[PDB]
């Protein structure tokens, strides 16, 4: 007999695992517990803070939801109106000295007239071929060309996507992108060129809310707090080291054994295969591809510059900077950085020089958060990436050479993006059903490795729906039908369902 | 305070309501009851029997859901509760029994027609190569799939006889998301090879209850319910629905309070019982056909010309029925034993039998369907005789065949019609009922034919309860293509909830 | 026996008949003569002159044939017999002079219209990508080339004003074999770049006679013929054609016997002169428009707003003419020299001049065309004033401009219409004439507009003779696309036959 | 001064040169003469006769005409009704032991059913692709696949055309084929499959006439006889050895020099370049391609076998025989072979063995004429080709092993077909204008090298039109617009034109 026995064991307390725990806690039938190796729940949605008081999320995380269930849990976790700030998505692409409104491919009107010709010509070619197309594109690259033409592919989509994914567009599938990549309408794009108009409203994150305090990680701390503490085991005491799938036993770092009837595993599936000592699965998971993410944070002295304005996040296809995205993180909340009266010395100027004095001066302060991708196809010099990012900020005119930097941050996250390679689905259909036959629900950004359902709301619901499948026979819609859940308002499942209403009578 | 109070009230014990009841009974959380005005559960999936002992259903099953299978296996668990058959169907066309699907078997038609059919399908294939719109009417869908020549021979005249409306007046989304395009190579190849081939075989089968017909399933399913939570018969006839008070009043005066209502009666009747004039006007804008079911019991061994045929399609105008079923092929117990003695009522040509004496069998049995609507009236007094003449005209019966039993019943609400206007009307009705905590679901509860056969209907009830209790998506109601194109294996009659509770 | 007998008789001394005569005179084998009821050769390519000294043609030459060039160079051999100009043309649209071709220059229009035009051309380009039929009407051809928006702005309303029938009633084979499809990229590129570009330049030119207008060519060409083989004037008016006896009767009673007839008169007149009621019935089923030519002589140096413009198109309804020609740009001698004194007849707004004194020039000159048909009547008594008002409306003239000369003439047979029914009717007429050894050829001799300008017409006559004498294919008559798509260099005014004979 | 001076010199008295001569003689203006190195005019349209009395043409030459002028000249030369025999074209493709009516691609209905499926499937694919085609095919092969589908390409068109052209279909252009290769209508071909019907009437040679005596060569002897004898120079006395294009002088083998003003050269253009000692022209003509043709003749004892019947010519795509075509030459005229009373010994049996008797026996006789192609891409064993053909006749069941052969014939024609290679036009537009600038009209099957206007009537009219261009400024329509002249009735030019009618008064 093992030390602990539960019906459902949840590994991981990021959004996916916390979703599973919330649904298990709501249903309150089968016994359960949740474990994580970090004392602070949140996974890749956690928030760091520099010694100078600048918060940085793991990547430009904004909250936007396809599911009422997710909303219920965030509102339960952070119920006050001043727990949240709402913002319009202000997003731009840096191109040839200009800020081009997102989506690029729908704002060709902003480029020089000569580039407009190249872009529209390519889009005419794509539209004529699309009129007689009877096949689907097989690669991300073919999709880009078929729906945008070469001109826009060469100017933006191809170089940008290598900088994000750390693989070329030719190496990725294209089924994942229904909700991420705008395919442009020839008439709408040409009309806006003729009229000199913009169109910034495309996509599901065109409006968002951001927590007032604690960054994204504050959400998941607050969510986890609603759980019965005795059903949680966070820290080294909850680090999983062995998974014995045949005995349905998990061994923790401190030697605690947990027997389960059903396992919801949200750790990276390649880690799970190793913890299972299952060489067949290790070999299979090693056929998946992922990129690492470097997050760089730069805290700057001064009131928010006019050139920055209300910008939220920014795309950088060009090779004059290492990062693919910048976030004006100080626009998301005033509490992402110190108050104006906080006194801080200048660590360096944006041009790399040292300040003359160690004098601590007051603010106000603003803050830039940058992301750089790394993979076996795209190495990154870890020792210089911070300075290269700051120089990239000067190259893109986001910082003046004289700007005073008062705080820096750099962290590398090994599993950053699960890559939608051409091979992903073929490998996953060998991995996930084999785990399924052992009553292991491997779910999450790296639990099930599908980026298109790898956001905080999708991840949360992957855990929710996994539990719903275990307990109530529910379809795991998010796991297997991203287009289906992304194309509808998912209103049916609530934090208080009929089951709980009728039981309380 | 009302006489009875339950969390969830289910009106109707046809497949839809029994699905709702089966899921409520499985969940065993909220209180509930199910009512029906008929003492026998089954609704429009019941089975009648003539005084001579021939059964007639109002039905072939194909299940898209493990949950449905679980409930049927629970109700009828023994292997000899069922007979399995291949899905053998033919189209009657110009003196020929053409295997279904029609287009793969035009080699049986005269060569001049094969030319016209292939030429039309070539046109459709070339058009499909440059098509960039979806078809808007059932008729356009037919033509794009088949071409003019093949369309005119079968699907156009047959579907008028089925729906009692012309194909140009029906929508086509209810048929699925598949692109309307011909398989030209498959059709020409069979013409070139001079072959026929039906879409059945050892893989393509159905099973049918050994006894009691289709209605036997639903009796057996209903028997698994706690009898005290059921109220079937005149004592369970609903006469008033007060949506504002969440009260139902029965014919005997009993009032039932509910928190959520699952109504499987026809939504136009529901609107009337609600005394909701707005919904009455809206529901009267829906369209439906009535169905005449005709049953004919025949003396004799099964003729060779009938053989293993199961159901048959009739596009041509030499018979009033659109479909015939060799119902005696579904079970030996759909008709009397060979030793049962019965007199001949008439010969197939209408003449009197030579003798009035009762003679022995064996017997076989034909079930026919005729549609009726304001665009296609039916003479109730002569339709039986017209059907029998149609059996002679189609060579299903010889003039000398001995008829030993007849059956004719008219069902007022027979098919909910997928008109062009259906969805515009339903999207005004269903949300107004939903805002009153009324789940109106089923063949005429929600009026969508494509989810109105037995397995879909049952699951409409199951998923309605699952939505009420567990927040499930009602996938069958709103996404028929989605559920039909996948393996619906997740939901079971024993879910994890019940497993974990039992230990 | 008739009064005169020749192997080949030519009726008409416009370009077509003069082509026949030139080839006959070059071959110098079979006997021949040419007649015309006018004392001056040239037909509908003649030139009138107003009493005030302004020339107006009945204009611009593009030659597909070296043979035609040889004859023009023989007739007018000096370099100063001709002036060369670029082919500068514009479409008047919504207050703008839009360079031809219209669709490459819509950037001059309001942005909302550019959107409508480009959207329509996108629709047309996508339909052209899956097209598998040919257009059946001129209208369908226009829409497939241009899209709805651009069609509605120029080619649809303009061609009604030209042909006096709607575009839906005309065939479109007469335009050539080129596929009816848009150049979407070219049109969008000029919109994106905000550019204009006309289809002219240093090598897209035409030449025009220095003196005597277009009519000077045909006088000079006819002068190279042996005078005794010509019969021009009332003495050459044909009044009867007896196709069975192969006899022509002239107005003065002279009878001419022929073995082969090249008739360049209008085929409906020919059927009447033949007293062939069947052919009268068939020819009366052909359709044609009448043409009013209006000329306006203006005092002053050429205004900057006019500039180097040559001819102009008018789709809009603020003027009755479909075409205007800056005829004073074609030659300085199309109008009086600057020292010529002329009184002002009226101002462009219709008012009277302050003085009736004759004042000096210089002068410039506008030539206008208005169409007329049973589907589009024209008031003969007011059309001149309507044209002048149209010149004000289109800003070609300011209200104050001084008009010193006017000209108005109506030509009953102006354009032979490429209706849908034309070919069905012609293929019954021409073979019936051919069986009687009558080659009916020319703008109205054979009624095909696309080979009815000067070089095609001339070559219709040349090729008819070459067919009569040498068994040549009449390529221009039956294969316009063929002759228009090649350099027709083989036939020369001096062929091997004449070289070897000398 | 040269020995002779004429305005127009014609080299060659095949159909092309005789056309030039006939038009020059009709016009009767410029002085002229015609030379040929063979005493018998006719060129590649000549007729040989074996010692046993069997006539064989060069190829399966049959007369079918696009021009009234050509008809006028044939009717003048052979004016009596019994100078000619008229025949329906009975033509078949030997395919898998069966005779499939020509054209093959329109008679799919005759093949085994499994092959009909493959053929119709291929045409369906082609028809759907053709529905969205917006480019023209560039090679003969691409044309075949586009208009016929793979099944018919792989079954017939690809192997037969290699067997004829001695180059693969991928190496040929496709502008030449309008009147040679039937493009199948999908509906017509499918309809005939369904109905079990045939459609053997396609093409300009569905009917033909053949001279009663002397074979095809009898025509050209008779046409040449209408010329004034003193303006002809046929034989070794008329062999051209040097052409001095700069002096406009031709030197004959016997040393005679002829001065000309215009040259109509109908010898092979590569021979002309060699005779000109113009190395530039030699190099260009060597870039042209041609195949050689072997004509094999077999005289057979017996009344015409039932299996042969009224067949005229036959196609052999398969590898059980070396010839691509067989002609039942004895069906063209009874005077192509000896009368029945002629006594001839059996030379061999068709199986190669010696006859039982050497004694001369009577007829009747019939006669087979075979064609085998040769090129640098398709070598041929010259020494065994006669025996290989006879064995192929047995293999194809045209001869029984016991059939008695009474006469054999084999002749190789070095210049047999001018190949429509992809490079042909690019080379010709360098050759023909360069010769044109020297007043040399190089015209004919190998004079101008265009197979699509390489038949007897096209060749004749090339000579006629060259003269008409030299004298009357006529367009050389046949040379430059094969589709134009092949698609119309060329009725305008006659042997008696208006010029001559008016002159005779
Ligand atoms: O059944 C057939 C037989 C021939 N050909 C084509 O017709 C062309 C001309 O062949 P033909 O026998 O008519 O003339 P020849 O080879 O003697 O010049 C050939 O190259 C073939 O590709 C064809 O398409 N289908
Ligand atoms: O000789 C008459 C001939 O050229 C015309 O009929 C062509 O149409």
């Amino acid at each position: 007999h093992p030390d602990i026995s539960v019906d459902v064991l949840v590994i991981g307390a990021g959004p996916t695992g916390l979703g599973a725990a919330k649904r298990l806690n709501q249903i309150d039938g089968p016994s359960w517990m949740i474990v994580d190796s970090n004392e602070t729940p949140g996974g890749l949605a956690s928030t760091d803070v520099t010694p100078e008081g600048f918060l940085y999320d793991v990547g430009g995380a904004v909250i936007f939801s396809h599911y009422k269930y997710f909303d219920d849990c965030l509102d339960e976790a952070l119920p006050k109106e001043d727990d949240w700030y709402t913002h319009q998505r202000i997003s731009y692409v840096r191109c040839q000295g200009q800020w081009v409104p997102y989506p690029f491919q729908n704002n060709i009107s902003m480029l020089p007239k000569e580039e407009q010709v190249k872009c529209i010509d390519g889009m005419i070619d794509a539209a004529l071929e699309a009129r007689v197309a009877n096949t689907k594109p097989k690669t991300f690259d073919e999709w880009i060309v078929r729906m945008m033409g070469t001109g826009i592919a060469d100017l933006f989509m191809r170089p940008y996507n290598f900088k994000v994914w750390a693989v070329p567009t030719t190496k990725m599938q294209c089924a994942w992108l229904g909700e991420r990549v705008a395919a442009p309408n020839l008439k709408a794009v040409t009309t806006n060129v003729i009229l000199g108009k913009t169109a910034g409203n495309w996509g599901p994150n065109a409006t968002f809310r951001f927590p007032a305090r604690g960054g994204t990680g504050g959400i998941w701390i607050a969510v986890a707090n609603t759980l019965p503490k005795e059903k949680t085991r966070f820290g080294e005491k909850g680090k999983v080291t062995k998974v014995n799938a045949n005995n349905k036993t998990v061994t923790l770092q401190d030697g605690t054994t947990i027997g389960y009837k059903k396992l919801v595993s949200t750790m990276a599936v390649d880690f799970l295969a190793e913890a299972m000592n299952d060489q067949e699965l290790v070999g299979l998971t090693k056929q998946l591809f992922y990129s690492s993410t470097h997050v760089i944070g730069v805290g700057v002295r001064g009131s928010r510059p006019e050139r920055i304005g209300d910008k939220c996040w920014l795309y950088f296809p060009e090779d004059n900077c290492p990062f693919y995205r910048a976030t004006i993180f100080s626009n998301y909340s005033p509490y992402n950085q110190p108050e104006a009266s906080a006194a801080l010395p200048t660590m360096q100027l944006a041009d790399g020089s040292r300040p003359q004095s160690t004098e601590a001066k007051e603010g106000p302060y603003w803050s830039i958060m940058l992301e750089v991708s790394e993979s076996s196809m795209k190495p990154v010099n870890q020792e210089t990436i911070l300075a290269d990012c700051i120089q990239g900020l000067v190259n893109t005119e986001m910082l003046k050479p004289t700007d005073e930097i008062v705080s820096t941050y750099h962290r590398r996250f090994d599993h950053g993006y699960p890559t939608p390679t051409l091979e992903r689905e073929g490998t996953l259909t060998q991995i996930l059903p084999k785990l399924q036959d052992k009553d292991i629900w491997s779910r999450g950004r790296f639990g099930s490795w599908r980026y298109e359902v790898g956001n905080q709301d999708h991840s949360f619901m992957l855990g929710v729906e996994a539990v719903d499948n275990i307990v109530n026979g529910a379809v795991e819609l998010t796991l297997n039908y991203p287009d289906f859940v992304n194309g509808r308002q998912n209103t049916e499942r609530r934090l208080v369902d009929g089951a709980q209403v009728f039981a309380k009578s």
Side-chain angles (χ1 to χ4, degrees), chain A residues 241 243-266:
Chain A
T241 57
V243 174
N244 187 329
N246 289 343
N247 298 140
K248 290 188 172 184
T249 299
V250 161
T251 297
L252 308 181
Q253 178 166 267
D254 59 39
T256 305
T257 56
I258 304 174
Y260 60 84
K261 296 176 181 174
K262 318 291 173 171
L263 182 64
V264 178
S265 178
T266 78

Short mmCIF file of all heavy atoms in Angstrom, two decimals, chain A residues 241-266, unseen atoms left out:
data_model
loop_
_atom_site.label_atom_id
_atom_site.label_comp_id
_atom_site.label_asym_id
_atom_site.label_seq_id
_atom_site.Cartn_x
_atom_site.Cartn_y
_atom_site.Cartn_z
N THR A 241 9.27 12.42 -9.04
CA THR A 241 10.49 11.86 -9.59
C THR A 241 10.28 10.54 -10.33
O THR A 241 11.04 10.25 -11.26
CB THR A 241 11.54 11.63 -8.49
OG1 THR A 241 11.00 10.77 -7.47
CG2 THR A 241 11.92 12.96 -7.85
N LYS A 242 9.28 9.75 -9.96
CA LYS A 242 9.01 8.49 -10.62
C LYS A 242 7.51 8.36 -10.87
O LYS A 242 6.69 8.70 -10.00
CB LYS A 242 9.52 7.31 -9.77
CG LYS A 242 9.53 5.95 -10.46
N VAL A 243 7.17 7.88 -12.05
CA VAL A 243 5.80 7.51 -12.38
C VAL A 243 5.81 6.03 -12.77
O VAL A 243 6.45 5.65 -13.75
CB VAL A 243 5.21 8.37 -13.51
CG1 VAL A 243 3.83 7.85 -13.93
CG2 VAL A 243 5.12 9.83 -13.09
N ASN A 244 5.13 5.21 -11.98
CA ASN A 244 5.01 3.78 -12.26
C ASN A 244 3.61 3.55 -12.84
O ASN A 244 2.65 3.31 -12.12
CB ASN A 244 5.24 2.95 -11.01
CG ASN A 244 5.28 1.45 -11.30
OD1 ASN A 244 4.61 0.96 -12.22
ND2 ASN A 244 6.06 0.72 -10.50
N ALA A 245 3.53 3.61 -14.18
CA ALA A 245 2.23 3.55 -14.84
C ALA A 245 1.55 2.19 -14.67
O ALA A 245 0.32 2.10 -14.71
CB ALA A 245 2.38 3.89 -16.33
N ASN A 246 2.32 1.11 -14.49
CA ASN A 246 1.70 -0.21 -14.34
C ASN A 246 1.07 -0.40 -12.97
O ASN A 246 0.00 -1.01 -12.86
CB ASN A 246 2.72 -1.32 -14.61
CG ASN A 246 3.10 -1.41 -16.07
OD1 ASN A 246 2.41 -0.89 -16.95
ND2 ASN A 246 4.22 -2.08 -16.34
N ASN A 247 1.69 0.13 -11.92
CA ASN A 247 1.14 0.07 -10.57
C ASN A 247 0.27 1.27 -10.24
O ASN A 247 -0.28 1.32 -9.13
CB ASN A 247 2.27 -0.02 -9.54
CG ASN A 247 3.10 -1.27 -9.70
OD1 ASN A 247 4.32 -1.25 -9.57
ND2 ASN A 247 2.43 -2.39 -9.98
N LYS A 248 0.16 2.23 -11.15
CA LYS A 248 -0.56 3.47 -10.89
C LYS A 248 -0.10 4.08 -9.57
O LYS A 248 -0.87 4.33 -8.65
CB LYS A 248 -2.07 3.22 -10.90
CG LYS A 248 -2.62 2.93 -12.29
CD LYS A 248 -4.15 2.89 -12.30
CE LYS A 248 -4.68 2.78 -13.71
NZ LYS A 248 -6.16 2.83 -13.74
N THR A 249 1.22 4.28 -9.49
CA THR A 249 1.91 4.85 -8.34
C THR A 249 2.85 5.95 -8.82
O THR A 249 3.52 5.81 -9.84
CB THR A 249 2.71 3.78 -7.59
OG1 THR A 249 1.82 2.77 -7.11
CG2 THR A 249 3.44 4.38 -6.42
N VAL A 250 2.85 7.05 -8.09
CA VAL A 250 3.79 8.14 -8.29
C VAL A 250 4.68 8.24 -7.07
O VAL A 250 4.21 8.05 -5.94
CB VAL A 250 3.03 9.46 -8.56
CG1 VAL A 250 3.91 10.63 -8.31
CG2 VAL A 250 2.54 9.47 -10.00
N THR A 251 5.97 8.47 -7.29
CA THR A 251 6.93 8.68 -6.20
C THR A 251 7.42 10.11 -6.24
O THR A 251 7.84 10.61 -7.29
CB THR A 251 8.11 7.70 -6.30
OG1 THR A 251 7.65 6.35 -6.16
CG2 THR A 251 9.13 7.98 -5.18
N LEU A 252 7.38 10.78 -5.08
CA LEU A 252 7.82 12.16 -4.97
C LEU A 252 9.28 12.20 -4.52
O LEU A 252 9.86 11.20 -4.11
CB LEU A 252 6.93 12.93 -4.00
CG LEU A 252 5.43 12.83 -4.28
CD1 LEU A 252 4.66 13.65 -3.26
CD2 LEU A 252 5.10 13.29 -5.71
N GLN A 253 9.87 13.40 -4.60
CA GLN A 253 11.29 13.55 -4.27
C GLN A 253 11.57 13.17 -2.83
O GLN A 253 12.59 12.54 -2.54
CB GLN A 253 11.77 14.97 -4.55
CG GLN A 253 13.23 15.16 -4.18
CD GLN A 253 13.81 16.43 -4.75
OE1 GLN A 253 14.39 16.43 -5.85
NE2 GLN A 253 13.66 17.54 -4.02
N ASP A 254 10.69 13.55 -1.90
CA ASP A 254 10.87 13.18 -0.50
C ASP A 254 10.54 11.72 -0.21
O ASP A 254 10.54 11.33 0.96
CB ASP A 254 10.01 14.08 0.40
CG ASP A 254 8.52 14.01 0.08
OD1 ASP A 254 8.02 12.91 -0.23
OD2 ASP A 254 7.85 15.06 0.13
N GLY A 255 10.23 10.90 -1.22
CA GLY A 255 9.94 9.50 -0.99
C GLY A 255 8.47 9.17 -0.81
O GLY A 255 8.12 7.99 -0.70
N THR A 256 7.60 10.18 -0.76
CA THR A 256 6.18 9.91 -0.65
C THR A 256 5.68 9.20 -1.90
O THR A 256 6.03 9.60 -3.02
CB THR A 256 5.41 11.21 -0.45
OG1 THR A 256 5.93 11.91 0.69
CG2 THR A 256 3.92 10.94 -0.22
N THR A 257 4.88 8.16 -1.72
CA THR A 257 4.24 7.47 -2.82
C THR A 257 2.75 7.80 -2.83
O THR A 257 2.10 7.86 -1.78
CB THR A 257 4.43 5.95 -2.76
OG1 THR A 257 3.96 5.45 -1.50
CG2 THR A 257 5.88 5.58 -3.00
N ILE A 258 2.22 8.04 -4.02
CA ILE A 258 0.81 8.33 -4.22
C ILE A 258 0.26 7.32 -5.21
O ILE A 258 0.75 7.22 -6.34
CB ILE A 258 0.59 9.77 -4.73
CG1 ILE A 258 1.25 10.77 -3.79
CG2 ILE A 258 -0.89 10.04 -4.89
CD1 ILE A 258 1.21 12.21 -4.29
N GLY A 259 -0.74 6.55 -4.78
CA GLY A 259 -1.48 5.70 -5.69
C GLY A 259 -2.66 6.48 -6.24
O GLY A 259 -3.29 7.26 -5.53
N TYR A 260 -2.95 6.26 -7.52
CA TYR A 260 -4.05 6.93 -8.20
C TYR A 260 -4.84 5.92 -9.02
O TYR A 260 -4.32 4.87 -9.42
CB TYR A 260 -3.54 8.07 -9.11
CG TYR A 260 -2.61 7.57 -10.19
CD1 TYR A 260 -3.09 7.05 -11.39
CD2 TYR A 260 -1.23 7.58 -9.98
CE1 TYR A 260 -2.22 6.58 -12.36
CE2 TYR A 260 -0.36 7.12 -10.94
CZ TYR A 260 -0.86 6.62 -12.13
OH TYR A 260 0.03 6.15 -13.07
N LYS A 261 -6.10 6.25 -9.27
CA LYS A 261 -6.85 5.50 -10.27
C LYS A 261 -6.78 6.17 -11.64
O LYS A 261 -6.69 5.47 -12.66
CB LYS A 261 -8.31 5.34 -9.83
CG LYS A 261 -8.46 4.52 -8.57
CD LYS A 261 -9.90 4.47 -8.13
CE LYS A 261 -10.08 3.67 -6.85
NZ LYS A 261 -11.49 3.78 -6.36
N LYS A 262 -6.77 7.50 -11.68
CA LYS A 262 -6.59 8.25 -12.91
C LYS A 262 -5.57 9.36 -12.67
O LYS A 262 -5.58 10.01 -11.62
CB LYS A 262 -7.92 8.86 -13.39
CG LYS A 262 -9.11 7.94 -13.27
CD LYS A 262 -9.05 6.77 -14.26
CE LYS A 262 -10.17 5.76 -13.99
NZ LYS A 262 -10.24 4.74 -15.08
N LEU A 263 -4.70 9.57 -13.65
CA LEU A 263 -3.64 10.56 -13.56
C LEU A 263 -3.85 11.63 -14.61
O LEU A 263 -3.97 11.33 -15.80
CB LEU A 263 -2.27 9.91 -13.75
CG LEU A 263 -1.10 10.89 -13.62
CD1 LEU A 263 -1.04 11.45 -12.21
CD2 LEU A 263 0.21 10.18 -13.98
N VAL A 264 -3.88 12.89 -14.16
CA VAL A 264 -3.85 14.04 -15.05
C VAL A 264 -2.45 14.64 -14.95
O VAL A 264 -2.10 15.25 -13.94
CB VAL A 264 -4.92 15.08 -14.70
CG1 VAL A 264 -4.81 16.27 -15.62
CG2 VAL A 264 -6.31 14.47 -14.81
N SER A 265 -1.65 14.43 -15.99
CA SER A 265 -0.26 14.88 -15.99
C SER A 265 -0.15 16.12 -16.87
O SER A 265 -0.40 16.06 -18.07
CB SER A 265 0.68 13.79 -16.50
OG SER A 265 2.02 14.25 -16.55
N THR A 266 0.26 17.24 -16.27
CA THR A 266 0.46 18.47 -17.01
C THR A 266 1.93 18.85 -17.11
O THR A 266 2.25 19.91 -17.66
CB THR A 266 -0.34 19.62 -16.39
OG1 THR A 266 0.32 20.14 -15.22
CG2 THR A 266 -1.70 19.12 -15.99
#
